């Protein structure tokens, strides 16, 4: 069962992040209702936040918000935060940006990702890409 295997990796990561076991149980229960694409993408986002040294309680809170999104939203968010890390955006800023993106609808997120990619292709400076993304989010 590939879903169960992926769920066990998530449970292991949450334990290594000192997430309260009571919260792990409630999270695991919610994850068991998602499809395998959502579960795998959520695993990746956890791995990325862990790589950025995001505080465990913040990872837990962010995960709980992401569990309510569909595969398309979760995937596009992963790509955005991967690009922001590549551009050396401070993890504290990536965290705050991710919290804002979660409330946006899928069309806006897809448009933002395209915009970031367009600007990268145009050789725009990392700080300019961050500032423009932050401005488009506030809009």
Author numbering: 2 to 140
Paper text:
Here we describe a systematic approach to generating modular and rigid repeat protein oligomers with coincident C2 to C8 and superhelical symmetry axes that can be readily extended by repeat propagation. Repeat proteins are composed of an asymmetric structural motif that is concatenated several times in tandem within a single protein chain. From these building blocks, we demonstrate that a wide range of unbounded fibres can be systematically designed by introducing hydrophilic surface patches that force staggering of the monomers; the geometry of such fibres can be precisely tuned by varying the number of repeat units in the monomer and the placement of the hydrophilic patches. All multiplexes follow the naming convention CsHRN_Rr where s is the cyclic symmetry, HR stands for helical repeat, R is the number of repeats in a single chain and N is an index to differentiate between multiplexes of the same symmetry.
We determined the high-resolution structures of five designs from C2 to C6 symmetry by X-ray crystallography, cryogenic electron microscopy (cryoEM) or both. The crystal structure of C2HR1_4r matches the design model with an overall backbone alpha carbon (C-alpha) root mean square deviation (r.m.s.d.) of 1.54 Å. C2HR1_4r has a large repetitive interface composed primarily of leucines.
